[PDB]
Ligand binder design. Structure first.
Ligand SMILES: Nc1nc2c(ncn2[C@@H]2O[C@H](COP(=O)(O)OP(=O)(O)OP(=O)(O)O)[C@@H](O)[C@H]2O)c(=O)[nH]1
Ligand SMILES: Nc1nc2c(ncn2[C@@H]2O[C@H](COP(=O)(O)OP(=O)(O)OP(=O)(O)O)[C@@H](O)[C@H]2O)c(=O)[nH]1
Ligand SMILES: Nc1nc2c(ncn2[C@@H]2O[C@H](COP(=O)(O)OP(=O)(O)OP(=O)(O)O)[C@@H](O)[C@H]2O)c(=O)[nH]1
Ligand SMILES: [Mg+2]
Ligand SMILES: [Mg+2]
Ligand SMILES: [Mg+2]
Lengths: 435, 429, 429
């Protein structure tokens, strides 16, 4: 009845989605091969149902290099996906925005849109698209910016949520990351509805102290990011005392058309041994999700102000102490709201407790909180990246790879002035308003 | 998919290549007879990148071994592990270049360049999606430095949208293997600077010191020297041959390591390097791997990085590790050692991780740094070339086979121009 | 049904026919004694096209071997695989033609063609439904040239509505086997142009180059040359000898490859040709088969197709393959290689596929090109004849046995007109 399809672009999107679809197949009790062993349907929103008992996901895996898709084709989730959905190219974008947006990615975009149309036409109550893509890659930052220009034309007004991977301040792999991120943000700033940011460095610290682990590989990080994604769409697939649909985030977290960059947060994240010595009440997991050491983006909310918030409880939660805990939080002077937002909280309660995958680092709990806050403190993240771009562009380093692959030197200047206006607007409206 | 073509020119290229295909065959479990004998199925997932499927499940390497004299091909063909190459690829002349650039680029190399190019072209059509070329040669010889340059110019005229690498063995300051070294090296670099995407420069005594104080070897022959180079050569490609957490490829590196079209002379490296006796007293872990490869002692090109600044740096790890440990230390290395990193390139480190450890090791890596200390090598060669050119010594067997004085004076002004721009970016703010 | 009568002339015709019947008997599983020994019945399904049934289930070839000098007949009778030919077909004279067209056309030709025509008529009336004739000879000798010309003329007179192929060994440009080649070559080519249907020109120097370079043979001999020629001929005939997905016949080939009545001089070629040692390093497939087919070095006529344009091309495959691959590669070859294809003949490629691979091979292919490079051969022969006739050498030994200079002038004029028309149609828009 209510359908939403997910698009995974690049290696970051495919690897994250490889762990996300392992979670949905477990919540709904779906075997890895598609068969079956709050519920009356549940899987109808994500799993299209075929003639037999097999369910296939509404996913479109796309990549330019073939070195990662064949891992999915060979791995344990081989019989699940529709073989025609997994689209692969010949050679990657090689961390180049021009290659994955002008020359190489243009020979595959027409095939991808054919699969999207063949998926949207089969469903009736399509809500919106979920895009899992990185920011520093070539096909995860230059090709996903080609999809929005095409999806926003075929489908006029639909919610288009994103789950990006912000480049961390210190820990970073690419060398031309400031070049790819600035160009992507300037182009996707008009064809996106709500872009959630997640940082790789912040999750390293969260998984180190709270979970008490020493070797957090990329499999551990992707297993934790997927929990936030499943928590957002928990009300679509399950009943609850106070439901929240996908369109609710658009009209509650986006005061202005350009300020649509919330940062996710999850709680509680505790190990198996630490779970026995904790009461795990509603009044403290709300406190745990508000501390500055539990945010999943490397920025401190104390420097900024909270424009809006959104808490999505689930499990054994009573709607009374939720109000009591939230009222206490506002009174505390550690957090502060903006003057023109007298009310800045949106709550949602679900009836399905979070599930735990076998062999997972997290332990089984009966309550969970996923907090998505749109705060001014993210303006310091744009300033840091805007400084890196201006440092390399002054000496015109690495430019010759972009110019000779289907771009002009004037495009780099336009993408710079746009980010200067967005940064200015993020503090002009966040400052006190006279009279 | 994304297969590459291997071209070996000269004597050093044939000797390095003869040890290069020993490592690749062992990695993929390929018997010397040419038929697969391995156990794990991950090896055969991507075998077309280097090998070529033939009839009756036989694998033939995609290599083109060529040299002007027939002395070298006798050893590889008649010796062991010479039963798997295709006899068509064995291209050779009758008289060697005689350590002359003119005899390998105009006179004798012009006879063979039309026969090898008919095999390079044939190999490309059978290829599904060509990725690039690989050339191993020397900058001091006659055919490796003269004719290997000729192949570069002709290939670049037919496949402009391709990426090729040269694993040159640049001469050494302390000892000269040939008396007329600077004439050949200067004339080759003037051509390698125009038709090559990245070049890995390797010295010879810098490999002797590594084999002496680190590997603890008393009499290192050329068998134990080419084995150390081949490991570095096989570490760059392994990202696109095996699945990994953070993959890379040949084109991905060229974007990160080459800020400007002329600054593509790299300095490779390897780790861990330990003696056989003293391998039980060390814990194989990421924190010591990064510490070992970042010191001037363990570098395969005899140029101390302390005299310059790293423009960009790559680190292609292997084995199985944790992404947190890898990214935690390269921040510590950058923060603790911020003195020799360029300021106008924030975050000048590229890191990739594979999942298949090398044969007989828990983990390893490979270090590729586009440092500025390479400047001190081109300064020395241009100094030696100037001294000989003024007295016109040895010059009259280069003019007697096509070349002239005007050609020399343009191959040295270009060399000095590169040095000037290689230093103005070290002190640039 | 569709019987074919084979006629062999001269020493070259006799030797090529001996090799050809060796190949045909091996293909059809016929014992040298003349009785069936094979296993599959597909060989027996159509055996009357070449062989002829005889009492006690014997099979006798439908060949008529004839030559003036008895040495070749004695050799073929005394040697192995001479116990199956019919002795009546063994026709010979006493004194050879002595490399004289006049002697081979006006002196011994009379009685020899009387007897040969008697035998030919008897064989044809014994045949059920005649398909065509085959004649293998040389344009340089006396008896072969002149008497094959006389046989062709008489057979054309007797059976106007019939096809005949001529396999002619054209003289070489580099080294001449006989001093007076051009006179015989010019007269024979004039008569053939007058009254033949299709002609496959084959050279000896081109065959020697093919055997030395591609086959990698140190001592190429007439046995190997005749083996190659016989393989080409068997590949031509197999289309109607055996069933296939897309059958073709001699009339089909003539219709598709002869656009004008005076243009029927084709260039043959065979694939694959590989050395014994280097046969297990190649993947036998249609791509590489066509690639080996469509290169000048693999051409059996000493004419470089790059000097002309392919008027028409025919390709007879064998073995089991895919029509999708065959047509896709034909389209790719035509698109990439359009420059040397005639513009006013769109779709200038004929393709036929059989279903029985040759002995000891997965698949093969025979290529027959009607091109415009024969113009150079005709021009060279005409120039040599013009010089020799202008100085009036060796001519009183053609005048002393019936002929006169009028015939030579007419033949030269016809040759010049043919070459001029060939060039003018090559250069047409
Ligand atoms: N959280 C998380 N991030 C990842 C993972 N894999 C890769 N990344 C991020 O992705 C970045 C690399 O850029 P990508 O967009 O993945 O590059 P790509 O998808 O291979 O496309 P190309 O740039 O053309 O090679 C790295 O900086 C990582 O931070 C993962 O498994 N989990
Ligand atoms: N690393 C390494 N270098 C070698 C080896 N063998 C030779 N070399 C180097 O290669 C150079 C030899 O010059 P080449 O380019 O091979 O000359 P060539 O192939 O013999 O042909 P000519 O120049 O005509 O003599 C020497 O200066 C050595 O420094 C080897 O086994 N390992
Ligand atoms: N391809 C090939 N050509 C041959 C072979 N043997 C002879 N020839 C060619 O055939 C020619 C022989 O001339 P023939 O027509 O047979 O003349 P003849 O039978 O000797 O009798 P005369 O014409 O009187 O000289 C030579 O010029 C050779 O070029 C052979 O075994 N293979
Ligand atoms: Mg990629
Ligand atoms: Mg040599
Ligand atoms: Mg004779």
């Amino acid at each position: 009845m209510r359908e939403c399809i997910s698009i995974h672009v690049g290696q970051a999107g495919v690897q994250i989605g490889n762990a996300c679809w392992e979670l949905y197949c477990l919540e709904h009790g779906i075997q890895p091969d598609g068969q079956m062993p709050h519920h009356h349907d549940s899987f109808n929103t994500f799993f299209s149902e075929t003639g037999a008992g097999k369910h296939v996901p509404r996913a479109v895996f796309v990549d330019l290099e073939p070195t990662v898709i064949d891992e999915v084709r060979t791995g344990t989730y081989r019989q699940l996906f529709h073989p025609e959905q997994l689209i692969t190219g010949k050679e990657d974008a090689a961390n180049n925005y021009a290659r994955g947006h002008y020359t190489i990615g243009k020979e595959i975009i027409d095939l991808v849109l054919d699969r999207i149309r063949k998926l949207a036409d089969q469903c009736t109550g399509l809500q919106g698209f979920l895009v899992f893509h990185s920011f520093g890659g070539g096909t995860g930052s230059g090709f996903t910016s080609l999809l929005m220009e095409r999806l926003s034309v075929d489908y006029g007004k639909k919610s288009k949520l994103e789950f990006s991977i912000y480049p961390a301040p210190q820990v970073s792999t690419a060398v031309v990351e400031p070049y790819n991120s600035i160009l992507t943000t300037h182009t996707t700033l008009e064809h996106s509805d709500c872009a959630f940011m997640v940082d790789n460095e912040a999750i390293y610290d969260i998984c180190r102290r709270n979970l008490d682990i020493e070797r957090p590989t990329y499999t551990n990080l992707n297993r934790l990011i997927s929990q936030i994604v499943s928590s957002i769409t928990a009300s679509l697939r399950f009943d609850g005392a106070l439901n929240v649909d996908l369109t609710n985030f658009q009209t509650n977290l986006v005061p202005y058309p350009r300020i649509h960059f919330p940062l996710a947060t999850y709680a509680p994240v505790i190990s198996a041994e630490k779970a026995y010595h904790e009461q795990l009440s509603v009044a403290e997991i709300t406190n745990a999700c508000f501390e500055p050491a539990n945010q999943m983006v490397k920025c401190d909310p104390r420097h900024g102000k909270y424009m809006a918030c959104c808490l999505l409880y689930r499990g054994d939660v009573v709607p009374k102490d939720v109000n009591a805990a939230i009222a206490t939080i506002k009174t505390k002077r550690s957090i502060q709201f903006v003057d023109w937002c007298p009310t800045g909280f949106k709550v949602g309660i679900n009836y399905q407790p979070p599930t735990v995958v076998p062999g997972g680092d997290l332990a089984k709990v009966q309550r969970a909180v996923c907090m998505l806050s749109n705060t001014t403190a993210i303006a310091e993240a744009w300033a840091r990246l805007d400084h890196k771009f201006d440092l390399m562009y002054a000496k015109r380093a690495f430019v010759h790879w972009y110019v000779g692959e289907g771009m002009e030197e004037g495009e780099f200047s336009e993408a710079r002035e746009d980010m200067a206006a967005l940064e200015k607007d993020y503090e002009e409206v966040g400052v006190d308003s006279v009279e | 998919m994304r297969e590459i073509v291997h071209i070996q020119a000269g004597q050093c290229g044939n000797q390095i290549g003869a040890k290069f295909w020993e490592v690749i065959s062992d990695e993929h479990g390929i018997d010397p007879s040419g038929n697969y004998v391995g156990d794990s199925d991950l090896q055969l997932e991507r075998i077309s990148v280097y090998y070529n499927e033939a009839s009756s499940h036989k694998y033939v390497p995609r290599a083109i071994l060529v040299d002007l004299e027939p002395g070298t091909m006798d050893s590889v063909r008649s010796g062991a592990f010479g039963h798997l190459f295709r006899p068509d690829n064995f291209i050779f002349g009758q008289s060697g270049a005689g350590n002359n650039w003119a005899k390998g680029h105009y006179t004798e190399g012009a006879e063979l360049v039309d026969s090898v190019l008919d095999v390079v072209r044939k190999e490309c059509e059978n290829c599904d999606c060509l990725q690039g070329f690989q050339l191993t040669h020397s900058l001091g010889g006659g055919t490796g430095s003269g004719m290997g340059t000729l192949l570069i110019s002709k290939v670049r005229e037919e496949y402009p949208d391709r990426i090729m690498n040269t694993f040159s063995v640049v001469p050494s300051p302390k000892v000269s293997d040939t008396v007329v070294e600077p004439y050949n090296a200067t004339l080759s670099i003037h051509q390698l600077v125009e038709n090559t995407d990245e070049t890995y420069c390797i010295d010879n005594e810098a490999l002797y010191d590594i084999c002496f104080r680190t590997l603890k070897l008393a009499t290192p022959t050329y068998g134990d020297l080419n084995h150390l180079v081949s490991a570095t050569m096989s570490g760059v490609t392994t990202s696109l041959r095996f699945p990994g957490q953070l993959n890379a490829d040949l084109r991905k590196l060229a974007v990160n390591m080459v800020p400007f079209p002329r600054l593509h002379f790299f300095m490779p490296g390897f780790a861990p390097l330990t003696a056989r006796g003293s391998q039980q007293y060390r814990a194989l872990t990421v924190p010591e791997l990064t510490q070992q490869m970042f010191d001037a002692k363990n570098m395969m090109a005899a140029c101390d990085p302390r005299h310059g600044r790293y423009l960009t740096v790559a680190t292609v790890f292997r084995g199985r590790m944790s992404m947190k440990e890898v990214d935690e230390q390269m921040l510590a290395i950058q923060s603790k050692n911020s003195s020799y990193f360029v300021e106008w390139i924030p975050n000048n480190v590229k890191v990739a991780v594979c999942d298949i450890p090398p044969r007989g090791l828990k983990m390893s890596s490979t270090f590729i740094g586009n440092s500025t200390a390479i400047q001190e090598l081109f300064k020395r060669i241009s100094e030696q070339f100037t001294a000989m050119f003024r007295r016109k010594a040895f010059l009259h067997w280069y003019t007697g086979e096509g070349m002239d004085e005007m050609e020399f004076t343009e191959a040295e002004s270009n060399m000095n121009d590169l040095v000037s721009e290689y230093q103005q970016y070290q002190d640039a703010t």
